Structure formats: structure tokens, C-alpha cells
Amino acid sequence: GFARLKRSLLKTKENLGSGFISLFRGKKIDDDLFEELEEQLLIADVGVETTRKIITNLTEGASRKQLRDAEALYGLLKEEMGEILAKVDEPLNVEGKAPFVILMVGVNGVGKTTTIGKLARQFEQQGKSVMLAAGDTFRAAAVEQLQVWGQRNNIPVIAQHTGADSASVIFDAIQAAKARNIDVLIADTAGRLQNKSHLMEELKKIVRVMKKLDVEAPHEVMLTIDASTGQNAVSQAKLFHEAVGLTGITLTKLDGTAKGGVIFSVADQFGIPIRYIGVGERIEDLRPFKADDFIEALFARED
Numbered sequence: 591g592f593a594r595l596k597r598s599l600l601k602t603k604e605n606l607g608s609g610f611i612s613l614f615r616g617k618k619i620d621d622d623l624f625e626e627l628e629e630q631l632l633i634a635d636v637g638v639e640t641t642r643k644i645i646t647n648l649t650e651g652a653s654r655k656q657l658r659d660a661e662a663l664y665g666l667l668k669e670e671m672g673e674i675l676a677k678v679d680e681p682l683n684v685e686g687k688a689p690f691v692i693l694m695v696g697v698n699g700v701g702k703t704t705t706i707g708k709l710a711r712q713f714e715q716q717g718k719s720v721m722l723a724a725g726d727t728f729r730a731a732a733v734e735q736l737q738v739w740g741q742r743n744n745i746p747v748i749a750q751h752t753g754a755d756s757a758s759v760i761f762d763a764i765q766a767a768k769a770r771n772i773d774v775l776i777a778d779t780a781g782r783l784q785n786k787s788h789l790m791e792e793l794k795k796i797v798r799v800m801k802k803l804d805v806e807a808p809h810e811v812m813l814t815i816d817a818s819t820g821q822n823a824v825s826q827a828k829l830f831h832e833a834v835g836l837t838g839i840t841l842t843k844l845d846g847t848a849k850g851g852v853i854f855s856v857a858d859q860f861g862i863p864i865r866y867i868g869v870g871e872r873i874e875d876l877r878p879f880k881a882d883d884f885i886e887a888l889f890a891r892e893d
């Protein structure tokens with residue numbers, strides 16, 4: 591089962607999940623084994639803190655249960671790592687708002703820009719009217735790219751001159767969305783990390799301004815991070831969550847990277863729902879995150 595996701599995770603399965611089998615084959619449970627397992631988790635970008643938790647719980651379980659053969663650790667690991675992901679399994683529900691406002695935050699990159707377009711296309715296929723707000727106002731090339739994408743797909747894009755106030759662009763976009771019976775408004779934001787304090791004050795202003803039109807907006811603050819960036823995804827998540835309240839995460843580029851293990855660090859450290867994972871280039875390859883499918887694909891050795 592889950593053959594498509596197994597293929598997407600092929601490189602990650604070399605070190606995690608089914609990748610544990612060859613590590614445990616024929617070994618005894620002792621300090622040396624747990625040291626090697628810890629190293630393998632860290633090499634897979636699970637992160638120091640999440641790895642320490644896994645090792646602590648696995649060591650105590652094996653000791654209390656008086657396990658002797660390392661092979662038995664496979665099942666315990668599947669349970670422990672499966673629970674990490676199940677705790678952040680909650681799909682995004684955009685129904686019933688006028689409009690439902692998604693504030694897209696994260697650092698500038700192919701991930702965030704592509705995710706906006708894929709989500710917009712998916713929502714349209716679901717029968718919803720979509721509008722985009724070009725809130726990354728100082729990057730003229732990014733704004734035009736979004737306007738061009740909107741014209742190619744007949745989706746309206748709200749934009750102002752280069753250097754306009756991002757909070758004003760998004761405010762005007764919400765007003766236009768309400769006036770035009772839009773179901774979902776997706777607002778892009780700046781993603782420059784050179785001046786951390788400036789970006790976070792900018793995001794806080796965007797959120798405050800929205801409340802004049804709808805106290806419930808933004809209905810979702812979605813972070814986009816790239817699994818191929820390893821621990822940079824974790825530090826980016828920490829920065830954006832501490833400044834603005836994240837309510838969902840999209841993790842892109844899980845396919846073809848040996849760093850897929852970072853999903854466990856993101857899930858464990860922040861406890862924010864992972865709404866979507868990107869496992870391919872098609873629109874539909876931005877798929878709703880299902881923790882059970884993911885863990886089964888990761889740990890199953892069959893195809």
C-alpha cells in the first residue's frame with residue numbers, strides 16, 4: 591500500500607522507518623545501539639530535542655518490557671514517531687466564510703509562491719471563488735509574477751505600487767473580496783529575513799488592520815517551509831510562530847530529499863497542524879497531510 595507516497599519518500603526511507611531495519615538486524619539492545627540510533631535520527635534532521643525525547647522514551651520502554659533484541663525497537667519507534675505526526679493531523683477547513691482569509695507567511699522561495707497557486711487552483715476545483723492579495727509589496731518582480739499568474743488562471747489579484755504598505759494592500763483586498771462575494775482570499779506577505787524585527791512588526795500590523803473588517807480574520811495563518819532545507823525549516827517555523835500566531839503549516843519538497851525527517855521536528859517542537867505536504871509538481875501533489883498514511887509509507891518495507 592501507499593506506493594506513491596513510498597516513492598516520494600524513497601530517499602528518506604534510507605535512514606528512517608524501513609531504514610531502521612538494517613540498523614537493528616542482529617543487534618542487542620545496549621548503550622551502543624541507542625548511540626547509533628541517535629546519530630541516525632540526527633543525520634535525518636529529526637533535531638536534537640525531538641531525538642532526545644524519542645531515545646528517552648524508547649530506552650525506558652525497552653528496559654521496562656525487558657526487550658533483548660534490537661528488532662523489537664522497530665515497532666516501538668513506529669508507535670512513538672507515529673504519535674508525533676498524529677498530534678498534528680488536522681486538515682484545513684475553509685468553508686463558510688465571506689471570505690475565508692489565509693495569511694501566507696514564510697521566507698521567500700519557490701515553496702510559498704507555488705503553494706499559493708496550487709491552493710487557489712484546488713479551491714476553485716472545489717467550487718470556490720478565490721482572490722489573491724500581493725502583500726509582498728517591495729519585491730516588484732514577485733508582485734508581477736503573481737499578477738501574471740492571476741491573469742493566466744483568471745483569478746483576481748489585488749496589488750498596489752512598489753513599496754506600498756502591505757497592511758493596506760491586504761485591507762483593500764479583504765474589502766474587494768467581501769464586495770465581490772469571494773469565498774477564499776489568500777494573502778501573500780514579505781519573507782525577507784535580513785531584518786527580523788521589521789518583518790515581524792509588519793506581520794503584526796497586517797493582522798491588526800484586518801480586524802476592522804472582520805474580527806475573525808485571518809482565519810488561517812499558514813507557514814510554508816521547505817523540507818529540503820533541513821533545520822532551517824525549524825528555525826523559520828520558530829521565528830514566525832513567536833511573532834505571529836501560526837495555525838497551519840505546509841511542508842514542501844518532501845519528494846526526492848533525504849531530509850524528510852524534519853517533519854518530526856516541526857511536529858514535535860511546535861504542535862501546529864500540518865495542513866498539506868508537497869510530494870510532487872502537480873497541483874494535486876500538494877496533498878492534505880494524513881499522519882497514518884505517512885507513517886505507514888515510511889515504515890512499511892513492502893511496496
Ligand SMILES: [K+]
Nearest residue numbers: 700701704842
Ligand atoms: K513546491
Ligand SMILES: [K+]
Nearest residue numbers: 737738741742
Ligand atoms: K499577463
